[PDB]
Amino acid sequence: MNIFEMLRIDEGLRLKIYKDTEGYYTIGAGHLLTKSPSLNAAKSELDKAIGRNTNGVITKDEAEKLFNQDVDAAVRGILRNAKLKPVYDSLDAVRRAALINMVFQMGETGVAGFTNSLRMLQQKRWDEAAVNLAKSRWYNQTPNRAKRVITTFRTGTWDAYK
Ligand SMILES: [Cl-]
Ligand SMILES: [Cl-]
């Protein structure tokens, strides 16, 4: 198991524009296109991302390319973030993937906001962090996914994904 396989299970890989859990236009493995209600705006953003007139449909390779870019950007966002970097540096390889997953889903700013959970993770207080992580909109809105990531932080294993 690795970060790509993990996110692929969590996000899937749709080749046609679709709406995410929040109702926003997205494509591929969770690649948000726009928060605007306009399909046209979405198609515009898509064509600009891919560099061709797509008509709302992309190929698998194109989807994977967006995926690779997005994982890369999440990692780099963490590394540049003053609140996130120290946490990431303190964790083992499995837990690092879990932090990447949250950043991928909610953005650096969003995760950087889990102040208390981050401190707990840094201190290696696993069960405490897991409880704190669950007290959030994130957990209430996407419980199954959140449970998988939390278990990953709690155990340091990939059991939730196997
Ligand atoms: Cl892009
Ligand atoms: Cl879920």
Domain extents for the chain? 1-162
Q: How far apart are CA 95 and CA 107, in angstroms?
A: 17
Give the largest Cα separation in the chain, rounded.
50
Please give the resolution of this entry in Å, rounded to 1 decimal. Answer: 1.7
What experimental approach yielded this model?
A: X-ray
Q: How far apart are CA 79 and CA 85, in angstroms?
A: 5
Measured in Å, residue 102 CA sits from the centre of ligand 1 at 19
Provide CATH code, domain 1-162: 1.10.530.40
Q: How far apart are CA 27 and CA 74, in angstroms?
A: 17
Measured in Å, residue 148 CA sits from the centre of ligand 2 at 9
Q: Which ligand ends up closest to the CA of 27?
A: 1
Q: CA 50 → CA 36, 93, 150, distances in Å?
A: 19, 32, 33
Half-sphere exposure of residue 93, counting CA atoms within 13 Å on the CB side? 4
| Residues marked as catalytic | 11, 20
Residue 2 contacts residue 161 (beta carbons within 8 Å): no
Pairs from 55-63 (Cβ < 8 Å, separation ≥ 24): 56/16, 56/17, 56/27, 57/15, 57/16, 57/17, 58/15, 58/27, 58/28, 59/15, 60/13, 60/15, 62/28, 63/13, 63/14, 63/15, 63/27, 63/28, 63/29, 63/31
Annotated binding site for substrate: 32, 104, 117, 132
Q: How far apart are CA 28 and CA 150, in angstroms?
A: 24
Q: How far apart are CA 100 and CA 85, in angstroms?
A: 11
Q: Which ligand ends up closest to the CA of 50?
A: 1
Measured in Å, residue 101 CA sits from the centre of ligand 1 at 18
Which two three-digit tokens encode residue 82?
Answer: 């003053």
Q: Which residues contact 74 (CB under 8 A, 6 or more apart)?
A: 100, 103, 104, 108
